[PDB]
Design a protein around this ligand. Sequence first.
Ligand SMILES: *[C@@H]1O[C@H](CO[C@@H]2O[C@@H](C)[C@@H](O)[C@@H](O)[C@@H]2O)[C@@H](O[C@@H]2O[C@H](CO)[C@@H](O)[C@H](O)[C@H]2NC(C)=O)[C@H](O)[C@H]1NC(C)=O
Ligand SMILES: *[C@@H]1O[C@H](CO[C@@H]2O[C@@H](C)[C@@H](O)[C@@H](O)[C@@H]2O)[C@@H](O[C@@H]2O[C@H](CO)[C@@H](O)[C@H](O)[C@H]2NC(C)=O)[C@H](O)[C@H]1NC(C)=O
Ligand SMILES: *[C@@H]1O[C@H](CO)[C@@H](O[C@@H]2O[C@H](CO)[C@@H](O)[C@H](O)[C@H]2NC(C)=O)[C@H](O)[C@H]1NC(C)=O
Ligand SMILES: *[C@@H]1O[C@H](CO)[C@@H](O[C@@H]2O[C@H](CO)[C@@H](O)[C@H](O)[C@H]2NC(C)=O)[C@H](O)[C@H]1NC(C)=O
Ligand SMILES: *[C@@H]1O[C@H](CO)[C@@H](O[C@@H]2O[C@H](CO)[C@@H](O)[C@H](O)[C@H]2NC(C)=O)[C@H](O)[C@H]1NC(C)=O
Ligand SMILES: *[C@@H]1O[C@H](CO)[C@@H](O[C@@H]2O[C@H](CO)[C@@H](O)[C@H](O)[C@H]2NC(C)=O)[C@H](O)[C@H]1NC(C)=O
Lengths: 41, 238, 336
Amino acid sequence: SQSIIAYTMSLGAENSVAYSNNSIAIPTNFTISVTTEILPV
Amino acid sequence: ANQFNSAIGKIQDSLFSTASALGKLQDVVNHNAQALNTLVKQLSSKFGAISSVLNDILSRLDPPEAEVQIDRLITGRLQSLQTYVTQQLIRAAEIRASANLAATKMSECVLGQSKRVDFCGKGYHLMSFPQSAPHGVVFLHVTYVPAQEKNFTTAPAICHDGKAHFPREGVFVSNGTHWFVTQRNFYEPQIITTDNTFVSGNCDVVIGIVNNTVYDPLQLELDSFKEELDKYFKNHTS
Amino acid sequence: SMTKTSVDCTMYICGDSTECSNLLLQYGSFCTQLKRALTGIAVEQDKNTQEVFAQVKQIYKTPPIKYFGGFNFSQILPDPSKPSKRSFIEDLLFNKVTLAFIKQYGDCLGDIAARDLICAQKFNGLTVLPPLLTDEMIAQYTSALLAGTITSGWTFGAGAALQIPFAMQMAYRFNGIGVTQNVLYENQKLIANQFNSAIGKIQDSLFSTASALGKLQDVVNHNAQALNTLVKQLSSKFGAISSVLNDILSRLDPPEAEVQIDRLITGRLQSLQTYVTQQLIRAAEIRASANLAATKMSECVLGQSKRVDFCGKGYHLMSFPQSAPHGVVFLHVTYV
Ligand SMILES: *[C@@H]1O[C@H](CO[C@@H]2O[C@@H](C)[C@@H](O)[C@@H](O)[C@@H]2O)[C@@H](O[C@@H]2O[C@H](CO)[C@@H](O)[C@H](O)[C@H]2NC(C)=O)[C@H](O)[C@H]1NC(C)=O
Ligand SMILES: *[C@@H]1O[C@H](CO[C@@H]2O[C@@H](C)[C@@H](O)[C@@H](O)[C@@H]2O)[C@@H](O[C@@H]2O[C@H](CO)[C@@H](O)[C@H](O)[C@H]2NC(C)=O)[C@H](O)[C@H]1NC(C)=O
Ligand SMILES: *[C@@H]1O[C@H](CO)[C@@H](O[C@@H]2O[C@H](CO)[C@@H](O)[C@H](O)[C@H]2NC(C)=O)[C@H](O)[C@H]1NC(C)=O
Ligand SMILES: *[C@@H]1O[C@H](CO)[C@@H](O[C@@H]2O[C@H](CO)[C@@H](O)[C@H](O)[C@H]2NC(C)=O)[C@H](O)[C@H]1NC(C)=O
Ligand SMILES: *[C@@H]1O[C@H](CO)[C@@H](O[C@@H]2O[C@H](CO)[C@@H](O)[C@H](O)[C@H]2NC(C)=O)[C@H](O)[C@H]1NC(C)=O
Ligand SMILES: *[C@@H]1O[C@H](CO)[C@@H](O[C@@H]2O[C@H](CO)[C@@H](O)[C@H](O)[C@H]2NC(C)=O)[C@H](O)[C@H]1NC(C)=O
């Protein structure tokens, strides 16, 4: 059954960057992203 | 082109379903309407007088006795007007700041390509398109997002002949056995070559330098031409 | 951001008095306007903090090995030996800047040494709302930003964090300012030593030379001064016989008490309006500062800036954030 719940905020998914000591990450492919911004004038 | 078309097609739904944005213009409209409603509803308050209607005070009292109630109403309504004007001035300052930002975004995102991070969208800004909205502007920011990364073994320099070679514009990568030089934003590997790198000093200074052959196009072309010339000579000399 | 305050209009003007409340009903929706403005200011403060700090999709973490090419980030990386994983510099900042507000002041102290300013303010309609993001959460956001910038560079600000050795990231940053990467690769130890010495001197310079770091204290002091003036205006008579509502009610009949009640009502309404107008102006100033701080986080920390003097004096290499009470601190690493 549905109910009102209280919790602590989740700031985000914890990602451990695989920082290595002579290793790099390079992208092999891309996307074109069209985002939107609204501004009162 | 297909990716841009798909994104601009999804724009027509993301602009009205995900909420988030597009509520700022509605907030402006609601704030203005609510302020006007409060100002016009402050006219039914008495502020200590016998009535909030001026005609009733003028019709039921003598001038010297009606003047007190008239002054009470004047004080209350004047205070309401100054409150409304002050809030309008503060909101106008806020809207002017927003409009200055919008003009800057039009100049730098639409009229040019911006290297300012996150100024014209999330990612590497490509371009921007303006659209008009009631009392506002909408920027469609077209940006470049690297998608499918792969991690390689990288080195700062390559040691070939007792000399350190650094990429002209790129990064040295290794897929496990061979070493290439690529561009930092898109995996396009190429053979390490004297036209791909520049020499600076010897191999005793750089931390992390590795051995790999920097192939010289001039020397190999000269050797191939000399081999062809030797074949041409042996065609008739021997 | 600044302190989120709430004012009980009826309790401030006409504390637990029904005659004064009935007389205050005749002034219209002034109390509703004041409450609406204060709620907008509080929501705006939470928004300011969110825009400045919540700029990372994920909570990035540094690897267990803390070697980054000889560069020593120990004084700015999180310290796990505390309940709040705050860095050395962040702890120093939070120690120096001391708030004057909410905690759990509902059980105010039983009058041991008079009463504090906060306890007295809380007794007449003036309360403080805690911020939505705790200092632990802000420190977590700052740590995620720092880990992302020292493990990936500017890539985590434009997509997925692509790991890169810190020496090579520094080489790219050198290329960004017009200096060849062989300059860094052949002077790597010297550059690391210079950065370590500067980051060591930062601890003394932040809290000894003063200059900056007085802005957050000024914000706190201005909020406290405004609240103190608002609570001290309750002892004014404003032309009435007594400043106490109870004395006026207990000494005069309603037809003659109402005049003094209305004098007090007018004075306290004017005080509240002045307080709220000043709060709106100060909130506009703080929002301008917060938008500037968000832009600095986006263009200095998440990437390398070519704008002159935007991210420090010299040729900008990188920047590191540190949370501070109601503010942010940017450590700008530049090339001179
Ligand atoms: C690592 O890469 C090498 C080289 O790849 C070649 O060059 C690249 C720039 C790209 O064009 C590749 O498609 C090329 O193959 C691989 O060595 C190659 O192996 C293939 C398969 O056996 C062979 O046909 C090629 O001749 C080889 N190239 C050379 C120069 O010898 C190597 O296998 C890759 N290693 C891994 C683990 O993927
Ligand atoms: C990178 O190469 C140097 C240069 O040595 C040459 O290349 C080696 C692979 C080997 O074939 C040597 O005979 C060549 O002269 C390496 O330095 C050598 O190190 C070894 C081991 O200590 C030593 O016996 C050689 O005398 C060194 N050579 C010279 C000219 O001083 C170096 O070790 C190589 N680095 C890596 C990471 O493989
Ligand atoms: C780069 O990513 C794009 C977008 O995902 C890929 O394009 C898709 O390719 C798949 C597989 O062939 C198709 O089913 C989709 O229709 C394609 N999408 C679009 C928008 O064209 C592309 O293949 C990727 N590039 C590489 C080299 O893998
Ligand atoms: C880069 O290489 C690393 C190391 O192998 C990869 O990171 C691992 O990812 C797996 C799968 O999610 C995890 O189980 C491991 O814990 C990760 N390692 C570390 C050290 O965190 C990573 O996936 C590789 N990158 C790409 C693009 O494939
Ligand atoms: C990255 O390579 C460097 C060498 O340039 C390593 O630094 C040494 O690491 C060993 C342990 O593996 C220590 O005993 C040395 O004291 C380190 N040297 C210095 C100058 O600090 C480094 O550990 C390597 N690996 C990682 C994971 O950082
Ligand atoms: C990085 O800096 C820290 C300081 O933040 C160094 O820790 C110091 O180490 C010395 C030598 O042991 C001690 O005398 C100091 O008291 C330490 N300071 C603190 C705050 O713990 C640390 O050694 C540096 N790292 C490297 C690799 O040199």
